[PDB]
Each structure stands twice: as C-alpha cells, then as structure tokens.
Design a protein around this ligand. Sequence first.
Ligand SMILES: [C][C][C]S(=O)(=O)N1N=[C]C2=C([C]=C([C])S2)[B@@]1([O])O[C]1[C]([O])[C]([C]OP([O])(=O)OP([O])(=O)OP([O])([O])=S)O[C]1N1[C]=NC2=C1N=[C]N=C2[N]
Ligand SMILES: [C][C][C]S(=O)(=O)N1N=[C]C2=C([C]=C([C])S2)[B@@]1([O])O[C]1[C]([O])[C]([C]OP([O])(=O)OP([O])(=O)OP([O])([O])=S)O[C]1N1[C]=NC2=C1N=[C]N=C2[N]
Ligand SMILES: Nc1ncnc2c1ncn2[C@@H]1O[C@H](COP(=O)(O)OP(=O)(O)OP(O)(O)=S)[C@@H](O)[C@H]1O
Ligand SMILES: Nc1ncnc2c1ncn2[C@@H]1O[C@H](COP(=O)(O)OP(=O)(O)OP(O)(O)=S)[C@@H](O)[C@H]1O
Lengths: 542, 542
Amino acid sequence: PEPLSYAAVGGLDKEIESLKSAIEIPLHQPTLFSSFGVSPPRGILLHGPPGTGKTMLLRVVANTSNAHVLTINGPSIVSKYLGETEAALRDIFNEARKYQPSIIFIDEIDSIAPNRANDDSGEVESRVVATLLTLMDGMGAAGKVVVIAATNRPNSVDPALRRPGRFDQEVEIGIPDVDARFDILTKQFSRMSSDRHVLDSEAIKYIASKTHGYVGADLTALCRESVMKTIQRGLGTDANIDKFSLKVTLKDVESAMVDIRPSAMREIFLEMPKVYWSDIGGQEELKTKMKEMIQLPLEASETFARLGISAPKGVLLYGPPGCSKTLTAKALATESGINFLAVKGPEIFNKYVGESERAIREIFRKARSAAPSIIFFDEIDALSPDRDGSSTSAANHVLTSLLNEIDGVEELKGVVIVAATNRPDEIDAALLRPGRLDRHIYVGPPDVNARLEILKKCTKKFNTEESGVDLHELADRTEGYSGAEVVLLCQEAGLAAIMEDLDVAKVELRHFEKAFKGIARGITPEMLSYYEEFALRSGSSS
Amino acid sequence: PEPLSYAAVGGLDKEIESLKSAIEIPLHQPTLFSSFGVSPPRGILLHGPPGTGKTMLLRVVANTSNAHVLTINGPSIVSKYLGETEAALRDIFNEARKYQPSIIFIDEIDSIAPNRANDDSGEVESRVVATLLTLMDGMGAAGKVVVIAATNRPNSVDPALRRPGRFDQEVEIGIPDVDARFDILTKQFSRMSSDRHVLDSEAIKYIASKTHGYVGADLTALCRESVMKTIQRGLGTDANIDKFSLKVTLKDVESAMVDIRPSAMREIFLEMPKVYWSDIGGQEELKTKMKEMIQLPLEASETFARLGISAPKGVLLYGPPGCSKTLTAKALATESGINFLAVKGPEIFNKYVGESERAIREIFRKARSAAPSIIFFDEIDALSPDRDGSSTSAANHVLTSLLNEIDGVEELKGVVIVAATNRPDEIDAALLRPGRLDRHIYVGPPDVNARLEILKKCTKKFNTEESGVDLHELADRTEGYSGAEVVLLCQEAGLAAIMEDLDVAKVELRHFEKAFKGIARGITPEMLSYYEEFALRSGSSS
Ligand SMILES: [C][C][C]S(=O)(=O)N1N=[C]C2=C([C]=C([C])S2)[B@@]1([O])O[C]1[C]([O])[C]([C]OP([O])(=O)OP([O])(=O)OP([O])([O])=S)O[C]1N1[C]=NC2=C1N=[C]N=C2[N]
Ligand SMILES: [C][C][C]S(=O)(=O)N1N=[C]C2=C([C]=C([C])S2)[B@@]1([O])O[C]1[C]([O])[C]([C]OP([O])(=O)OP([O])(=O)OP([O])([O])=S)O[C]1N1[C]=NC2=C1N=[C]N=C2[N]
Ligand SMILES: Nc1ncnc2c1ncn2[C@@H]1O[C@H](COP(=O)(O)OP(=O)(O)OP(O)(O)=S)[C@@H](O)[C@H]1O
Ligand SMILES: Nc1ncnc2c1ncn2[C@@H]1O[C@H](COP(=O)(O)OP(=O)(O)OP(O)(O)=S)[C@@H](O)[C@H]1O
C-alpha cells in the first residue's frame, strides 16, 4: 500500500494547483471568506473526458489532505427504496459536519442526479436530486465542509445542481497535450526503475509525439501493454527464459501502440500536429500577411485601443485545393505561441441537432477562457445554409449560433477567428460582411520561387545536384500545379526510382519526366477565374 | 466425460496462444511483472461473431488450467431482487479471492451489464454494472485472480467495462478463413474414426473451400447433418438395414450443405475467393502496374523511408463495366500474400447512420492491426454525396469519416487503400485530391492480346483447334467488347452447342457466329469519351 502523492499525477499541474487552492481556502480557513462577506464556495466539480485522471485526483486529494474523507458510493449506499437512502445520505453529511474539517466525495454524479433527461425515475432520480439540492442549500458559511464532484460528462448533470451558490467551482481536467503526454510518460516510466526501462528521453519525446489521441489512463495501459509484449519477447526467444530484467524497448512500445488504441479523443476538437514556417515553401507575402493580421492584433491590444480601432475579428483564407492553407494555419499555430483551437467543417456540422449549437458554444467559451486564442475553422463550406429545406433545421441554426457568437465584440478581445475554404461562394454572405469574418486573404497557386522551395524541401533526401537534375527547369515546367501536385510530383518521381530498382539511391531526370507526364493539372482556368471573380465581390483585402 | 483439450479447438492457434499467454502471466506469475510496476492486466475479453467458439474456449481453458474456476451463470445466480444478487456475486468473488489462484468466468456480458442501451433497468442493469465496476476497481496486484468474459457482440457492452486499467485485454475470435475451416473440419472428422469418414484430405479441402460463410459451430452442425443424412441413405436402400459402419461420403456432405446453412454470417467484411494472375487474360501492363504500386510499397517500406517519400496511399481503378477490376484486385489479394480486407460499396453506405461510421472505423482498425494490409473499396460510387438532402444525413457523415480516417498518415504506414469505381465522376473530389486516394489507373476494354487470352482460357474445355475455329478471327472480330462480354460470348457459343445436340463435344464457328449476332456492345463511344474526360481531369497516372 503506497499512498499516492501529487508527484504521481502528471500533466495537470495547472489545475492541480487550482484544485489545491479551492480545497485549501475553505476546509482550512473559512474565516477569510467570512470577513469578505460572501458564502464560501462549497463544491468543486472535476469535469473531463473519461479516463483523464479524475478518480485518481480524488484519491490523491483524500490521501494528501489531512481532513476526513467521506464517500457517497453512488449505488453502493442507496438502498432498495429511497426512504432509507435519503436518510443514509443525510447521515453521511451529518457525520461529516460533526467531524469538521471534512470532504464529501461524489463520483459519477451522472449516476446520481441526471434528472434533466428522460431516465429520471421520479421514485429514484428525482428524489436524489431533490435531496442533493435540499441539503446543499445549507451547511453554514462557518462550516469546514467541502463537496468534491467528478463527472465523465457534465451536461448530463441537470442545470439545477450547476446553478451558482451550489457546487459550482469548476476544474476542467482535459485531454493532455504533447507536453502533458510527455509528463505522464516520464512519471509512468519512472515508476519502474530506469534500469528496466531502456528509453532515453528522446524516445519518450517520440512516443509522446505518436500518441496524439491517447488520454490519461490510456497511456498507462500503453505502458502496461509494453510490459506484456516485453515478456512475450522473452518467450519468443525460448520458453526456458524465466530470467527477469528483460528491458522494455521503444520497439516494444510501438508494438503495444498498434494494439491498445482504447477510447480517447477522436470526437474532440482537433489539436493539429507541429509544422514550422520553414516547412512551408516560400509564400513570404502570405506568411508576412498572416503573421501581421493574426499575431500582431493579439500582441498589440494596448496599441490598438490607444488608436481607437478595434482589432481585426476574423480572417478568411480562400484558395484552390492543394495550396497552402491548412498548412499555413498550422504553422501559425505552431510558432505564434497563441492558444489555437481548430475544428474541421463536417466534424461540427454533423453533431446531431443541439449538439452543433452546444459545440459552437463550448468552442467559443474555451477560446475566451484561454485568451489570447485563435479559433480555426477548416472548411466553413460545411456550415453552409445554401441547401434545401433540410438545411433550415441544421445549417440555419448553426449559422445563426456562429453569428451570435462572432458579433458582440465587447466580450471578444483576445479571440481571432480564422476560417479556411476552397468554395468561398457557398459561405453565407452574412458571415463575410464587415464587422465579422471580413479580411479575405487569397492563397492561390504558388509562384515559381515557392515551387522551387517546395522541391528543395521534398527532393532533399534523394540526391539532386549530383544526380544531374536541376530543380529550376522543373520549377518553371510545373507552372499551374498546386503545391499538393508538386509534392505528389516528387513522390511519383521517387516511385519511378523504386520502379527501376529496389535499392536505388539516385534519381534521374527521366523519372521526373515520367512523373510529370503522369500528373494532370488540378487547377483549371475556370477555377482561377472563379477565384478572382469572388475577389472582386469580396469585402476586405481583395 | 471426455476432457476437452486444445487439440479439440481448431483454426484459432494464434488466438489460442495469445489467450494462453494472457492467462499464464497473471494467475501463475503475478510477481514476475509486479516488479515492473504496472498493475497486472486482470480481466480479458473474448470477442467473436455468434458461434465462432467462445464458450468452448472458456470450457477448455477451465479444464486445462490448474486454478479453480468460478462461474457467474448470468441469471442463474441473480435472484428476484438485486439486494441478494450483488451480495451473491460479491460472495463469488470473495470465494475466488480466498482460494487463489482463481478464474472468474463471465459468459454473455451482454446478458449481464448492457447498460449503454435503453434496456437498462436501473433496478437491475445499472445495479449490476455498478457492482461490477465497484468490485472490478480492486482485486489486488498480488491477487492471483483473473476474469475471463465472453461476448457475442462487444459494442453492446458499455464503455465502462471497457475502460483501460480495467477489464481490458481483448482476444478477437473471428470468422474462420479457408485454412482455419480446413483445420476445423479435419479435427471434426478425425474425432470420428477414419473408417466411417471416407473423405481424403483433398475432399476436406474441397468442402472447406465451398463453405465460405460457415463459422465454427456451423461446421460441426454440418458434420452432424452429414451423419444424419448418411443414415438416411441407410434407410434409403431398405429399412431392414440396421448394420452400422455406414460410411459418410462427400456427396452426403454436400447434401447436408444444401440444408445446414443458418443466418450465421451477415453482410460481414467479405473474404474473396482465389484467382491467380494466370486467370486474368493478359492486361500485362495493368498486371505490372498494380503489382508495383501496391505490393512493392508494402514490402519496401525501409527503402521508401530512406528516400524521404511517403508510400503511395491510394489507387483508384476506373474502367468500363466488365473489364477486369474486381478480378484484378482479387488476384492481387490472392497471390500478393498481403492481408486483404475488402468490403463492397453498397453494403456499407446503406446500413445506417452510426452503423456506417462504426463500420469504417472498425475496418480501418482491423487494417492497422494486421499490417501490412490492403483495404479494397469496390464501387465507392455508392458512398457519394452528390444527391439530395437525404445525403446530408448519410453521405456526408460517411464520407467525412472516410476522409478523416485516410488522412491519418502518421499511423498509416502499413496500409494501402484500393478502390474500383465504374463511374468515377460521382466520387467526391475530396477523395481524389493529392495526399489521399490519388493514383488513378484506367483499366479499359481489353486489347486484342487480352481478348485472345480470355478466349483461350474459356474455350479450353471444348475443342477449338481441331474444331476448325481459329481464335484470332474471333479476337479481332470482337473489338470493343468488354471482358465480361467476351466470356459471355464463349458461354453463348456453348449454349448453341448444347442447342444443336444434347451430348455434343464439338463447337463450330457457326455457333460462335450465332452468339456474335446475339451480343450487343455495352461499351458505347460515349462511355469511352466519359472515361477519357475523367482522365484529363485526374490527379495522378492520367
Ligand atoms: C509530414 C509533413 C506534414 S505536411 O507537409 O503537411 N504533408 N504531410 C503528408 C503529405 C503531404 C503531401 C502529400 C501528397 S502526403 B504534406 O506535405 O501535405 C502538405 C499540405 O498538407 C498539403 C496541402 O494541404 P492544405 O494545407 O489543406 O492545402 P489545401 O488543399 O488548400 O487545404 P484544403 O483543406 O485541401 S481546401 O500540401 C503539402 N504541402 C507541403 N508544403 C507545401 C504544401 N502544399 C503547398 N505548399 C507548400 N509549400
Ligand atoms: C469461376 C470463375 C471466377 S470469375 O472469372 O471471376 N467469373 N465467375 C463467374 C462468371 C464470370 C463471368 C460470367 C459471364 S459468369 B467470371 O468469369 O467473371 C469474371 C469477372 O468477375 C468479370 C469481370 O468482373 P469485374 O472486374 O468486376 O468487372 P467490373 O464491372 O469492372 O467490376 P464491377 O464490380 O462491375 S465495378 O469478367 C470475368 N472475367 C474473367 N476473366 C476476365 C474477365 N473479365 C475481364 N477480363 C478478364 N480477363
Ligand atoms: N496524469 C495522469 N492522468 C491520468 N491518469 C493517470 C495519470 N497518472 C496516472 N494515471 C492512471 O490513469 C488511471 C486514471 O483512472 P481514473 O482516475 O478512474 O480515470 P477517470 O478520469 O476516473 O475516468 P472515469 O472515472 O471513468 S470519468 C489510473 O490507473 C491512474 O493510475
Ligand atoms: N475450432 C472450433 N471453432 C469453433 N467452434 C468449434 C470448434 N471446434 C468445435 N466447435 C464447436 O463449436 C460449438 C460452438 O460452441 P460455443 O463455444 O458455445 O459457440 P459460441 O461462441 O458460444 O457461440 P455464442 O457466442 O456463445 S451464441 C462447440 O459446441 C463445438 O462443438
């Protein structure tokens, strides 16, 4: 029995500190809030997607805090009929009250008081929510009691429990980021002695990098699976190997990766990978314009206010498919340092009725929470009201929610909305009017310098100068290819290289010639003329 | 009471070894990786389509493991009300814990804790899932207890029992393949003495070949019916035959097949028959091209990585209806030696809203699991968003799932997606953009050499050279035919042969002339123009 400690928790140090404060300020000294004449906040609710580390945090709070732990075991104290159940829970609260200081732990409130939905059994669920409200109505500002709550989904909890003055302090324990994933991995692999874990910190970098979707508990599972497969490699050599100290290795960790893949973020707003400005080929004009028109307003708020001008509220990127738009937004995300929440088009539109408006609401709330922030909307084309009557019940509602959140700049100061599209017309004109998503930047097919840069980025691994191919004739021969077609031309050239030989280490011009014959232009002059005719009708930066 | 052994199980050797490993490492050697610091797995799940051999596997594991088995008999220990039921299951777990080492068998979790669906009676189902989780929360890292549970459909089980750090380890027992079917039949017919079973191993090969949809129990059922129909023939000669040792013959086994088939396999991800490169008439250019751009990337990954190019992810086969597309894909499957998941177009798009999402997610999970693999999407034309508002609820969701899943290059190193559409224009352009299903290959009507080879393959059985018909005048006379049209020309010639005589063994040019009169070209110049037009608009390998 090793008692847990805050060193065991990982990747949540920010909200670890927040929860520690929300426990220490009450439960150790309510006199402070007695002086300031507000009822002390009784009730901290730990949100979070499943497996993020709630229950572990509750256990570590119980172990670390010197107060007395009490538990509402959900069903495990509710009796057959509620007449004894309500008495039992009141008895729990009273026993906490007599032995102040005390903490009441409620796990899985969704399994206790979800009375908003249809599953509210008036004999059971309504009674439980009623008694929760009734006793939560008072424990005494002088009382040294606190209620802590953990739910895998908050909105399932009825709004009645989440009214203010009830348990309403909130700690949003969320999906770990890349650095948080590294923290969790380092702690987990330090739980085992470093002898058996032969992975240098660079290996942990790598495994954290390839564990995008994984959340919390999942990572421990990964480590556990690694153990198993390591043991299996001990048996794969010969069954007679009963010797211990078989090291766990990086290769074992991917071999585990391929098989664990449990429930984690695949229906959550995407955190995109890391790309720098160097990866993007040229387009220095667009790079400068984006750097300015996004990063500068978020880092010049005092200067903008001094000048009597509101900051730009929204920039819309439009260009032929393949040209660097998602990559440019990702690069801005990676090396602008601003919090950057991105959502694909369809992944928010589908979001069956109500879930769409809720999703827009929560994305904007999160954007406001961690200001300054950039909300990236890839393919606004999805959120288009330009369809038949079926769109009136889905597209119109989401469009008007987006409009209502976009406007009202008084509450929007550290938020910039960057949208991307390849079908600019089908973006409802109510969203490209002045005062709204109004700056329009046209990406367009890359110019010759940018194309040459893309070549040099993608042709570097296979010999070019000492293979007799000069990239400039390729660059001026590939006029009109969108950047995707340029990188595909490089890929097809490599495919010809492996065509002619399995272990070749050299790429000739004839391979590029075959590739260039094989690839067809994807940007017809129709599409170009389309984009300038949208440029004339545009609002800003035509 | 014959004791079950692993010799009785068949066609699951890989899964058998995995389960034996997952039962030996705990339950015999907990210390051997309690040192490693991770919590032991402690709870393994056996998936499987109904009748694929779960319950037998549990019985054999019980009868071969020296620990003591305890059975949660589902309802057979659940009482009238859950107050005694939860106590009884706690008592079961405690009696296991005291008598370490112990195994706890849960059969049909779905009949126990399916609380994710509407059939959750909060008095029963919620209580049972709650007591599971609450007791699954702790068994003791040194507690030599293991849970094994089996389900007929996993997703019906809630995510709560399938969180990690929990009842986690999964063993997938699937529909047996052809070789596994041979193994199961060999074991079944060797259970009965070889005297009664007069079928040489070749006959067993044949019967396994023509039992595509049969799974597991079904095959045993087949044997039963064989027995039954065999003794029916014992009564077919004369009722006085009470003599034993009536051999079971092959013909009896097919006569059983015509009746045994229940609804065991549904529109499951399809396994396709075997066709060799020799079967496909000519098309040597397409032979080489497909061989390279599919098999070569999946077998020279290190060379591609060394060269700085990503392997080609997707090949779309577009050709007129009749030319060898599905046949070419099947040939690649059969004699490329790579795992070949393949699902038809209409059988995934038109299932349901969430069912389609789940289908694509699971097909790609399976493709990743057994890498390298080739996902074949025959007739993506079904997955088309080019319809009315009804497509906004079905087509958009399925297409965005496909795009999101195929854009995951970071963990998609050993998968290639091959598609085959007969009208390529109705594929959403987002699925043919570079970086996605992008290499386009045109199959097209067979050239003269291919037509000659097709004839030679289909005319071999009935005499051609010594019948006075030379295949080259046929070959150059049948310009414009699709390959299917050519094989049907051969079939119609045979039909005229059996017209003019019931037991003929000779086909003359006049029969072919009648057939050639009776066949119209299904490949209009309009269709060839359409395909050339899509070629000029394509992305790669135009
Ligand atoms: C790993 C690396 C990362 S990245 O770069 O991003 N990538 N990945 C993978 C792949 C590729 C390609 C291929 C063929 S495969 B990559 O490279 O990609 C990239 C990007 O992504 C592209 C484009 O995209 P975006 O951005 O999106 O564009 P768009 O199309 O416009 O949008 P949408 O959504 O579609 S409307 O491409 C590429 N790149 C690179 N670099 C570059 C490019 N492009 C252009 N330009 C340049 N510079
Ligand atoms: C038994 C043998 C097997 S198979 O070959 O496959 N078959 N079977 C049956 C039959 C036939 C015919 C008839 C009239 S009856 B068979 O032969 O078939 C075959 C195949 O299958 C066909 C074609 O297919 P595909 O590929 O699929 O086409 P398409 O349309 O493209 O697809 P889809 O689905 O529609 S999109 O035909 C035949 N063959 C054979 N060989 C050949 C052929 N074709 C062509 N070519 C060649 N070489
Ligand atoms: N930093 C961490 N974040 C998350 N989980 C962690 C972390 N460090 C260790 N873990 C392990 O992850 C698991 C977390 O379990 P839980 O706390 O039950 O997850 P969860 O948030 O409770 O999911 P629920 O209770 O179903 S909403 C435990 O096995 C911990 O040992
Ligand atoms: N190798 C084998 N694979 C599958 N079934 C086999 C095999 N060998 C024999 N069988 C027979 O298959 C039958 C299937 O029994 P079960 O294990 O109950 O099937 P099942 O998996 O339990 O189906 P469900 O999911 O419980 S409805 C057994 O009774 C055996 O007689």
